[PDB]
Design a protein around this ligand. Structure first.
Ligand SMILES: O=c1[nH]cc(F)c(=O)[nH]1
Ligand SMILES: O=c1[nH]cc(F)c(=O)[nH]1
Ligand SMILES: [Zn+2]
Ligand SMILES: [Zn+2]
Ligand SMILES: [Zn+2]
Ligand SMILES: [Zn+2]
Lengths: 364, 364
C-alpha cells in the first residue's frame, strides 16, 4: 500500500467536553491521526479561571498521554490583563477564544461583537504575551430592520468588518477566524495576507473543518446529524473552502471543530444541538478531499506544517515525537461511537468508506 | 375591531392523512375556523383512483360532517386522461396535485419537473374539465456538474420557468403555485397577472401558508418542528410573502399546508419529516399577521373571497352554511396536540399566545 509521512499533525480546533464524554473522545484525537490539539473552552460554566484551565489539561493528559494539548480561555468579562499575564507566564493557555452571545453551543455567556472594545485590555495583554485570539466569526441574528438583517447564512459575512477592525487596531496580535464557511471569508483572509512572503509573516489565519469540505445546506436540511455552527452554506461556498484547503497558502490550516454530542441531543424536535463529530477519522476525512482534488502533495502543510508554524509549537512542549503515517487501506465509518455505558455519538459520514487509514511511527 | 365575520373560510392546501391521525386531524379544520378545505392526495399509496378518493371523502365527511371537502388526485405515472374526464364529471375531484420526485413527504412516486411533456395529455384533459392543477414548485436537488446546482434555497426559483411554460402551453388551465416561499416566486406571480382586472381573470394564482408568514431559516435551522418544504428562506423573502398576503390582490389566497406528523418523526437525528401542523389554529394564525400589518380589512379576501372565487365554490356544495366569526379573545397554543392514544403533535408556535379566537355562527 502507499504511505504518506505527515509528521506532527495538528487539529487546532477541538471540543472534548467533560465527564464521561471527555473520557470517550479524548483518546480519539490520537486515533484520528492528530498529534497536537487546540482545546476549546466552551464548557458549562466557561473556562475563565487559571485553576480550572490547569484542571482541564492534565485531565486530558491523563486521558491521552501522547497528545499535545494547547489550552484556551473563554473570552468573558471575568478576564483581567493580570490573569492573561499570569496564565501566559505559567504556560497554561495558548489563546483566548471568543463566542458571540447566543450564536452556538454554550455561547449564552458570550460577548456582543458590536463592542469588542470592552475587551481591548485583554487583547493588549494577549498581544504582549504572543497569545492567539480565536474568533467564532458570526454576528448574532437581527431580523428587524434598520441595518440589513443577520441570519445563519450571512452572519459570517456580516462579521468580516469586525475582524478587519481588530487586525487594524492590533496589527501584531495573532488572530484566527475559526471554521471559515463562506467564500467571502476566504477572500477576506486572502486579501489580508496580500503582501505575505513566508509563513511567519502570517498574523491573521483561518481554520477549515473537515465537514465543511463535504457539506452544503442540502446535507443538513432535515438532517440535524449534519447541523453545526457556522452552518454549511451554498455549493459556491464549499468550492471556495476546498480550493483554500488545497491552496498551499500558509494562512489556511486544519481545525476540525469536532463537537461531540450524545445522539439524544441531536434527535430533538426543537433546540437541536449544533455540532459534528469528526475526531475519530479527522485526518482520513481530510485525505479524502485532498485525494479527490489531486492535491495530496499539499496535505502535510494543511494538517501539520502551517498550524505548527502559526502556533509556534516547539518540540519542547510536544508530548510525543511519534509521526502520523497515512496509508491507503480502505475502511468503513461505524454507525455509532459509544462508550458502552450511557453515551452514543453519530460520527461524521457514518457508514461511508474512506480510502485512507492512519498509523503511528516513532522518529530518529 | 372586536369581531370580524369572515363568512365561508377556505384553506386550499390541507393534509389529513389516514387512520388514527385522520380521526385526530379532520375535526380540527372546523376547530381552526375553516369551512372549506382542499384535501391533498399524498397518502400511501397515492390517491389515483376513483374508488379511493370517494371512500376517502366519505370518511372525512363522517368524521367532520359540517366541513366542505374538495378532493384531488396525485399526479402519477399511471393516471389517464379518461380517468380525469370520468372523475371530473362524477364530481369526485377538483384537481390534481403535482409532487416533484423526492422533494417532500410521500413524493417518491412523483414527477420529474424537467419532462412535464409526458403529462401534457393529462393537463389537456384537466383544462377541458376546468380542473385545478396544484404545483409543489421545487426542482429536485442537483449537485452533479455542468449545470448550475439546485438546492433547498433556490429550488423554488429554479422551478419558476417550468410554471411559466406550463401556463403558456395551457392558457385556460387554472394553476396554483402552492405555498410560495421566495420573493422570486412572488414577483413572477405578479408579472403573470400584471393587468388582471379582477379575481375571475386570474388563472395562475399562489397560496401562502401561515408558517411562511412567520418563519425564516433561523427558525428551522435548529428546530425540526418548523422544518417544512419548501423551506422558509431569508427575511427578504418573508417581507415579500407577508406583503403579498395583505396585498388585497386576488391571485394570493390562503392554503395552510398543515402537514401533521407524530412527534417521533420530528425528533430524528436524520431524515426528519417535512411539515408544519397549523390546522388547529389556522385562521387565528393569519389574524395575527393581518393585525400586525394593520390590514385586517383584507383578511376576508385572503382567507375566503379569493379561494372561493378561484375554485368557483358554489353554495350547493357547501356542507354547512355556518359563518366563521373571528373575535379578539386571547388564547394560548398548547405544547402538544394528542389523541390520548399513540399520537402527539407539536402545533406551529406551540406555547405562544394569539390575539384572536374563532367561533361559528349560522346563516339565518
Ligand atoms: O462551535 C461550536 N459548535 C458546536 C459545539 F458543540 C461547540 O461546542 N462549539
Ligand atoms: O408539502 C408537504 N410537506 C410535508 C408533508 F408531510 C406533506 O405531506 N406535504
Ligand atoms: Zn465555533
Ligand atoms: Zn468550535
Ligand atoms: Zn408541498
Ligand atoms: Zn402540502
Amino acid at each position: 500500500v502507499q504511505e504518506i509521512d505527515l509528521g506532527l499533525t495538528c487539529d487546532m480546533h477541538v471540543h472534548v467536553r467533560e465527564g464521561a464524554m471527555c473520557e470517550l473522545v479524548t483518546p480519539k484525537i490520537r486515533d484520528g491521526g492528530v498529534s497536537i490539539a487546540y482545546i476549546m473552552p466552551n464548557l458549562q460554566p466557561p473556562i475563565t479561571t487559571l485553576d480550572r484551565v490547569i484542571e482541564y489539561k492534565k485531565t486530558l493528559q491523563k486521558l491521552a498521554p501522547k497528545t499535545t494539548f494547547l489550552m484556551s480561555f473563554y473570552l468573558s468579562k471575568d478576564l483581567t490583563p493580570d490573569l492573561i499575564h499570569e496564565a501566559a507566564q505559567q504556560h497554561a493557555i495558548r489563546g483566548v477564544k471568543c463566542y458571540p452571545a447566543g450564536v452556538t453551543t454554550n455561547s449564552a455567556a458570550g460577548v456582543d461583537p458590536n463592542d469588542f472594545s470592552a475587551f481591548y485590555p485583554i487583547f493588549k495583554a494577549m498581544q504582549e504575551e504572543n497569545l492567539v485570539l480565536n474568533l467564532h466569526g458570526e454576528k448574532p441574528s437581527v431580523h428587524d430592520g434598520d441595518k440589513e438583517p443577520i441570519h445563519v447564512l450571512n452572519a459570517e459575512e456580516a462579521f468580516l468588518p469586525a475582524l478587519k477592525k481588530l487586525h487594524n487596531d492590533f496589527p501584531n496580535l495573532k488572530i484566527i477566524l475559526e471554521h471559515c464557511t463562506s467564500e467571502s471569508a476566504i477572500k477576506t483572509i486572502e486579501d489580508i495576507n496580500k503582501n505575505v512572503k513566508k509563513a511567519t509573516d502570517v498574523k491573521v489565519a483561518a481554520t477549515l473543518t473537515a465537514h465543511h469540505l463535504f457539506l452544503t445546506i442540502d446535507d443538513w436540511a432535515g438532517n440535524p446529524v449534519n447541523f453545526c455552527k457556522p452552518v454549511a452554506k451554498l455549493p459556491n461556498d464549499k468550492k471556495a473552502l476546498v480550493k483554500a484547503a488545497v491552496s498551499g497558502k500558509p494562512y489556511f490550516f486544519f481545525g476540525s471543530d469536532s463537537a461531540p454530542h450524545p445522539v439524544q441531543n441531536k434527535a430533538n424536535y426543537e433546540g437541536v444541538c449544533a455540532g459534528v463529530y469528526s475526531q475519530s477519522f479527522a485526518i482520513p476525512y481530510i485525505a479524502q478531499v485532498f485525494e479527490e482534488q489531486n492535491a495530496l502533495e499539499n496535505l502535510k502543510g494543511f494538517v501539520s506544517d502551517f498550524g505548527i508554524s502559526f502556533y509556534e509549537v516547539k518540540d519542547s512542549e510536544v508530548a510525543s515525537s511519534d509521526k502520523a503515517i497515512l496509508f491507503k487501506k480502505e475502511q468503513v465509518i461505524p454507525q455509532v461511537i459509544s462508550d458502552g455505558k450511557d453515551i452514543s455519538i453519530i460520527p461524521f459520514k457514518a457508514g461511508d468508506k474512506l480510502s485512507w487509514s492512519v498509523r503511528w511511527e516513532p522518529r530518529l
